[PDB]
Amino acid sequence: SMKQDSRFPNLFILDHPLIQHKLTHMRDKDTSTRTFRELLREITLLMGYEITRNLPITTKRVETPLVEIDAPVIAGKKLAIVPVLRAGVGMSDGLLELIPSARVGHIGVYRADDHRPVEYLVRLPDLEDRIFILCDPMVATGYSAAHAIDVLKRRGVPGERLMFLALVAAPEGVQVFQDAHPDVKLYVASLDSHLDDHAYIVPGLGDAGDRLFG
Amino acid sequence: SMKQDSRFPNLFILDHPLIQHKLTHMRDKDTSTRTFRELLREITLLMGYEITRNLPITTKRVETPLVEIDAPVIAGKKLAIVPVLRAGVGMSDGLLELIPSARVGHIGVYRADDHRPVEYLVRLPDLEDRIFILCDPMVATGYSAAHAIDVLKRRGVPGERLMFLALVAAPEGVQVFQDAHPDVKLYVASLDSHLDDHAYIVPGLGDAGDRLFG
Amino acid sequence: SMKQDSRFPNLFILDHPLIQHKLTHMRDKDTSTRTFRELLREITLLMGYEITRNLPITTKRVETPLVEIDAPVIAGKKLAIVPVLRAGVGMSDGLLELIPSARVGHIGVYRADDHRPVEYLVRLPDLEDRIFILCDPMVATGYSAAHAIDVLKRRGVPGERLMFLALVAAPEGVQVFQDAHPDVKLYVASLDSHLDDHAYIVPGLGDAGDRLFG
Amino acid sequence: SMKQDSRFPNLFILDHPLIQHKLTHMRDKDTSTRTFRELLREITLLMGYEITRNLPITTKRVETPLVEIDAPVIAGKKLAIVPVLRAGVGMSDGLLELIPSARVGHIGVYRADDHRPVEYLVRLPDLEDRIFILCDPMVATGYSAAHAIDVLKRRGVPGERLMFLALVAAPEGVQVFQDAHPDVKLYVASLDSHLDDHAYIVPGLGDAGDRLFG
């Protein structure tokens, strides 16, 4: 299920034993770049599963080998998964595995530590009546997540239709993000403790890029 | 989360939107064999996740690239996944993705078609302090399922430590099941409505062996 | 590509660098039961790829988003993958991943070290104009492979339409197999050196069952 | 194995039956998005296997459950897989399954649409003694592909150590490609026939971005 920190009204910590367990193996610096990629997919599928408990259902006539029925379906086409380049791509794999019918978008943001112009790629589906789920493993300073969301907010889509998916966040990041977008939900596997002098999340996972790509 | 039927105190129906959705695509007789197989694996992964919400968590020592910590893990070894042959192997695979470190056992009973449990193959991990999770897509008559559980009971393991996982069950099958084993939790994606003359579940999925194997 | 031993006219050793490399990681006793399952799938997909270079092609009208064409296809329905229970199932996964349209069969054989009756499960598709590919990771004594093939030979299908897929074989096994079925091709990742006092392949992979199932 | 076209001395067409077969299912406009994605990943895994036939093999020390040996392995670290963003990420995934231990780099150029190579993102492993394998489904005009390779050339790496992998290429695209880079091996599943007015490959696959991403 779900867990919340007093400072952060829109942060949710998904603390299922198996998310937690799989997270630790990612945390472990002995874990290979292979297994690290898998766990990335795996956790995020699980997280996608918690977030989607309340998806509306409709029906559709389907023929089973025995009978025609009105069988329950979701409107998967109404969702857009938007990995943040480059480390978010492994996450969207897991969500795309969960909900294959979804639209995929992509956002390219340069890693800045303040509010300058940073965007280098935006590729998005049609915006009409559509929920957007962004993902990036790390929310360290919270600037990259803010800017990524900023892209959708510039295009007129409001907080209520936006979500951000992460693995690990630092409280200083969740705070920056919250200030910029208080109405956008942020889902997280763990709210870690602090940032170091080099802006790495502690205890964190180390440098995401290095562990995904060597 | 989970529904229940007034008739069956130890049957749980996992009705998360994406479980229902994915089940529908399996119900559909036009779904290719490629996809039918993947959906078997997927749904049971999700079903596993619901049923493992209450797993005990302890801590291993682990060093991240940054720091050494006491990180949450699970006792995965204390679990036995047991596909009922032949069709249960697909389900086994999804659970194994979820919990890789678990022991795998096998129960073959095509077989005990009606009269008694007839074991063609029973291969099991050690019993001491172990929870067993049996897998089979269909609980039609209930006899296959009850016999599969008999195998374990007749070797000393109490209901308390046994679970059966299926995709679809008929009410007559669940009755037969629970009369033999009132204390064994049976987990299902759907309780369909009835058996036809050939003892197939309606609306159900068809002949599972056929759709998984041609 | 392919390699051959002078003693064995119908044995083929598939010695691609990546098959070989992936084999070593399986050989390694430090390798987990998880990774061991994956590599099992992976090698056998690769092996399936070498075996199938000469599959006949036909055509089929297909519409691309631009044009209708006569596009190349295989008759995947004409092949049957037949894992030998229980350890062969992971292999058929890889072949089924490669050629999803294939029929799946299953053969249950008891591990004997001589020519007694051993068969406990036979489940097969229609035999008409159909090639059968059996698989089991280990060919130690060669009795299990012989008997498994014996099942198809009893049903009238000749050597020319049969194939056996293995990971590792011992020369004493390849010999027993050859004596019983000289016309049946046997594909192998490595022809290891000898059997030990306990009939384990040396250097081999250890006990297949233990490493797949803990 | 591999075909060649008289016009193109460094283009190789991988025409294994299952590569052709799987390509056809991608060509088909009725193939669901779920399946289209998996087939991208699959085909490139197979294409990788053909192109890695000649990999050097050395030996690590390894102990099997039975004995200690000198077992064949590969120098996987000496390889860089570089998806060309955005569509190349699917291909990257298949190669990574094949060779998990390889370094991943990224080249973003939607982009250098015509006039020059315009790098929106270039992230690369270290160059010293490294073979680079670029990935992109389509070589239509040839400009994307030539620019992606320019990126690496302009940073010092010779043709000798560069390869490009695509699903489908137009002859005009290959000409453009080889004029810029006569010494770079380009690997393809098919050389289709021509470009239409909108610069799409005929018969080709359609808009790849669209079919991968909705």
Side-chain angles (χ1 to χ4, degrees):
Chain A
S1 263
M2 248 139 311
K3 214 199 83 173
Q4 289 213 100
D5 185 280
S6 51
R7 291 159 295 183
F8 309 121
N10 267 340
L11 178 67
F12 308 89
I13 303 143
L14 313 188
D15 67 349
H16 192 289
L18 281 159
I19 291 175
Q20 253 172 293
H21 173 89
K22 280 166 179 299
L23 190 55
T24 296
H25 289 239
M26 286 205 276
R27 287 191 184 279
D28 190 336
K29 73 161 189 164
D30 288 319
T31 305
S32 70
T33 54
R34 181 187 92 99
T35 304
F36 198 85
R37 278 171 226 138
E38 297 287 24
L39 259 16
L40 214 223
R41 273 156 198 58
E42 278 165 25
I43 272 86
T44 161
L45 174 319
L46 298 177
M47 295 193 289
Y49 179 91
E50 290 289 356
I51 294 151
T52 40
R53 297 196 152 290
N54 304 320
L55 277 183
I57 302 152
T58 59
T59 58
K60 194 203 161 186
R61 283 264 125 188
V62 139
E63 308 196 331
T64 94
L66 299 307
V67 198
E68 199 177 287
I69 54 156
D70 282 341
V73 303
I74 68 155
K77 282 281 177 61
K78 273 171 147 289
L79 269 42
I81 303 321
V82 186
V84 179
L85 293 179
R86 28 171 219 161
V89 162
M91 295 181 72
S92 60
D93 288 359
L95 291 191
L96 249 31
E97 182 156 336
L98 183 78
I99 309 172
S101 58
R103 303 320 181 120
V104 191
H106 298 87
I107 291 169
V109 104
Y110 289 131
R111 322 288 171 174
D113 287 331
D114 78 331
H115 289 300
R116 38 153 279 218
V118 282
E119 158 200 323
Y120 66 92
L121 202 74
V122 175
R123 222 115 291 168
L124 290 165
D126 231 72
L127 313 178
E128 274 179 281
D129 283 295
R130 182 100 83 206
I131 284 161
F132 294 81
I133 299 163
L134 280 69
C135 37
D136 202 343
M138 253 46 195
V139 180
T141 67
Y143 283 100
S144 296
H147 305 320
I149 291 307
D150 262 352
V151 167
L152 281 138
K153 283 194 164 185
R154 270 177 237 123
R155 288 153 172 81
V157 9
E160 284 77 41
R161 290 202 281 134
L162 300 170
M163 274 184 243
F164 200 102
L165 238 297
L167 289 188
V168 177
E172 33 274 69
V174 187
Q175 188 74 56
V176 171
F177 178 88
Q178 182 166 115
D179 292 343
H181 321 288
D183 285 328
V184 181
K185 283 161 177 186
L186 172 56
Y187 293 100
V188 120
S190 166
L191 167 61
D192 276 18
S193 105
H194 63 277
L195 288 183
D196 72 352
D197 300 321
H198 292 280
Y200 285 117
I201 294 172
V202 183
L205 307 165
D207 183 275
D210 287 7
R211 298 207 54 193
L212 288 167
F213 317 126
Chain B
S1 290
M2 23 204 160
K3 291 163 87 265
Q4 295 199 76
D5 180 282
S6 64
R7 291 165 292 180
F8 313 118
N10 271 321
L11 167 84
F12 306 84
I13 313 179
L14 306 166
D15 69 337
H16 192 286
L18 289 158
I19 283 166
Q20 290 181 247
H21 178 88
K22 282 179 200 301
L23 186 64
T24 292
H25 287 248
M26 279 193 273
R27 294 196 189 273
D28 188 336
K29 71 177 196 200
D30 299 318
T31 295
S32 56
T33 318
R34 159 198 275 271
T35 306
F36 191 92
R37 294 198 200 109
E38 260 306 298
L39 258 8
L40 215 219
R41 204 163 279 139
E42 288 171 32
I43 296 210
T44 87
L45 174 319
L46 305 179
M47 284 186 289
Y49 179 93
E50 292 284 351
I51 157 195
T52 42
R53 291 194 170 285
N54 290 307
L55 280 189
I57 52 106
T58 38
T59 64
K60 278 206 170 179
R61 273 277 170 63
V62 156
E63 50 204 300
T64 83
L66 297 104
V67 73
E68 200 182 300
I69 54 159
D70 276 34
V73 292
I74 274 165
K77 292 223 239 313
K78 317 194 114 174
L79 256 56
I81 303 327
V82 197
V84 179
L85 304 173
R86 293 167 321 153
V89 177
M91 298 190 55
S92 191
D93 296 332
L95 284 178
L96 248 10
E97 287 193 31
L98 192 64
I99 311 137
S101 78
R103 314 229 168 241
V104 195
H106 296 88
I107 288 158
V109 164
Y110 85 81
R111 175 45 167 243
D113 257 349
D114 320 88
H115 61 291
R116 59 180 274 244
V118 200
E119 313 170 357
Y120 65 79
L121 182 78
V122 172
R123 222 101 304 176
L124 281 171
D126 234 287
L127 320 177
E128 276 45 63
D129 203 44
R130 187 100 74 198
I131 291 167
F132 295 85
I133 302 182
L134 284 62
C135 294
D136 204 302
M138 248 78 167
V139 175
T141 63
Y143 293 115
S144 282
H147 293 158
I149 271 140
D150 277 331
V151 157
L152 269 137
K153 279 190 168 193
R154 281 201 284 92
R155 282 174 181 68
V157 319
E160 281 64 22
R161 304 213 320 263
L162 293 178
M163 296 162 184
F164 202 99
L165 231 185
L167 283 179
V168 166
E172 32 274 82
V174 180
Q175 190 63 232
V176 155
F177 182 81
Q178 128 191 316
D179 283 330
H181 319 288
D183 280 317
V184 175
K185 274 157 183 154
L186 170 67
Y187 291 93
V188 110
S190 171
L191 182 68
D192 288 358
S193 78
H194 63 276
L195 289 175
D196 67 348
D197 297 326
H198 301 263
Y200 284 126
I201 302 174
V202 180
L205 305 170
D207 191 278
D210 276 353
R211 294 185 72 195
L212 294 167
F213 308 137
Chain C
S1 263
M2 248 139 311
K3 214 199 83 173
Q4 289 213 100
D5 185 280
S6 51
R7 291 159 295 183
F8 309 121
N10 267 340
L11 178 67
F12 308 89
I13 303 143
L14 313 188
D15 67 349
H16 192 289
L18 281 159
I19 291 175
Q20 253 172 293
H21 173 89
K22 280 166 179 299
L23 190 55
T24 296
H25 289 239
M26 286 205 276
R27 287 191 184 279
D28 190 336
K29 73 161 189 164
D30 288 319
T31 305
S32 70
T33 54
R34 181 187 92 99
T35 304
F36 198 85
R37 278 171 226 138
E38 297 287 24
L39 259 16
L40 214 223
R41 273 156 198 58
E42 278 165 25
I43 272 86
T44 161
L45 174 319
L46 298 177
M47 295 193 289
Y49 179 91
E50 290 289 356
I51 294 151
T52 40
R53 297 196 152 290
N54 304 320
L55 277 183
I57 302 152
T58 59
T59 58
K60 194 203 161 186
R61 283 264 125 188
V62 139
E63 308 196 331
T64 94
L66 299 307
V67 198
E68 199 177 287
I69 54 156
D70 282 341
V73 303
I74 68 155
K77 282 281 177 61
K78 273 171 147 289
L79 269 42
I81 303 321
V82 186
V84 179
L85 293 179
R86 28 171 219 161
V89 162
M91 295 181 72
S92 60
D93 288 359
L95 291 191
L96 249 31
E97 182 156 336
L98 183 78
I99 309 172
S101 58
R103 303 320 181 120
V104 191
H106 298 87
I107 291 169
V109 104
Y110 289 131
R111 322 288 171 174
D113 287 331
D114 78 331
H115 289 300
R116 38 153 279 218
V118 282
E119 158 200 323
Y120 66 92
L121 202 74
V122 175
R123 222 115 291 168
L124 290 165
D126 231 72
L127 313 178
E128 274 179 281
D129 283 295
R130 182 100 83 206
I131 284 161
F132 294 81
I133 299 163
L134 280 69
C135 37
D136 202 343
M138 253 46 195
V139 180
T141 67
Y143 283 100
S144 296
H147 305 320
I149 291 307
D150 262 352
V151 167
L152 281 138
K153 283 194 164 185
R154 270 177 237 123
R155 288 153 172 81
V157 9
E160 284 77 41
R161 290 202 281 134
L162 300 170
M163 274 184 243
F164 200 102
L165 238 297
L167 289 188
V168 177
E172 33 274 69
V174 187
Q175 188 74 56
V176 171
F177 178 88
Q178 182 166 115
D179 292 343
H181 321 288
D183 285 328
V184 181
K185 283 161 177 186
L186 172 56
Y187 293 100
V188 120
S190 166
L191 167 61
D192 276 18
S193 105
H194 63 277
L195 288 183
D196 72 352
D197 300 321
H198 292 280
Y200 285 117
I201 294 172
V202 183
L205 307 165
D207 183 275
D210 287 7
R211 298 207 54 193
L212 288 167
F213 317 126
Chain D
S1 290
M2 23 204 160
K3 291 163 87 265
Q4 295 199 76
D5 180 282
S6 64
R7 291 165 292 180
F8 313 118
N10 271 321
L11 167 84
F12 306 84
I13 313 179
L14 306 166
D15 69 337
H16 192 286
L18 289 158
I19 283 166
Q20 290 181 247
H21 178 88
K22 282 179 200 301
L23 186 64
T24 292
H25 287 248
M26 279 193 273
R27 294 196 189 273
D28 188 336
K29 71 177 196 200
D30 299 318
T31 295
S32 56
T33 318
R34 159 198 275 271
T35 306
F36 191 92
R37 294 198 200 109
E38 260 306 298
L39 258 8
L40 215 219
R41 204 163 279 139
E42 288 171 32
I43 296 210
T44 87
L45 174 319
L46 305 179
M47 284 186 289
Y49 179 93
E50 292 284 351
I51 157 195
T52 42
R53 291 194 170 285
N54 290 307
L55 280 189
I57 52 106
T58 38
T59 64
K60 278 206 170 179
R61 273 277 170 63
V62 156
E63 50 204 300
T64 83
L66 297 104
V67 73
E68 200 182 300
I69 54 159
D70 276 34
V73 292
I74 274 165
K77 292 223 239 313
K78 317 194 114 174
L79 256 56
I81 303 327
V82 197
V84 179
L85 304 173
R86 293 167 321 153
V89 177
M91 298 190 55
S92 191
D93 296 332
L95 284 178
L96 248 10
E97 287 193 31
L98 192 64
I99 311 137
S101 78
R103 314 229 168 241
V104 195
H106 296 88
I107 288 158
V109 164
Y110 85 81
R111 175 45 167 243
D113 257 349
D114 320 88
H115 61 291
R116 59 180 274 244
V118 200
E119 313 170 357
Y120 65 79
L121 182 78
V122 172
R123 222 101 304 176
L124 281 171
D126 234 287
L127 320 177
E128 276 45 63
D129 203 44
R130 187 100 74 198
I131 291 167
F132 295 85
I133 302 182
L134 284 62
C135 294
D136 204 302
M138 248 78 167
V139 175
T141 63
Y143 293 115
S144 282
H147 293 158
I149 271 140
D150 277 331
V151 157
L152 269 137
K153 279 190 168 193
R154 281 201 284 92
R155 282 174 181 68
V157 319
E160 281 64 22
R161 304 213 320 263
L162 293 178
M163 296 162 184
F164 202 99
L165 231 185
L167 283 179
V168 166
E172 32 274 82
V174 180
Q175 190 63 232
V176 155
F177 182 81
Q178 128 191 316
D179 283 330
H181 319 288
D183 280 317
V184 175
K185 274 157 183 154
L186 170 67
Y187 291 93
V188 110
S190 171
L191 182 68
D192 288 358
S193 78
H194 63 276
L195 289 175
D196 67 348
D197 297 326
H198 301 263
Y200 284 126
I201 302 174
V202 180
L205 305 170
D207 191 278
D210 276 353
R211 294 185 72 195
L212 294 167
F213 308 137

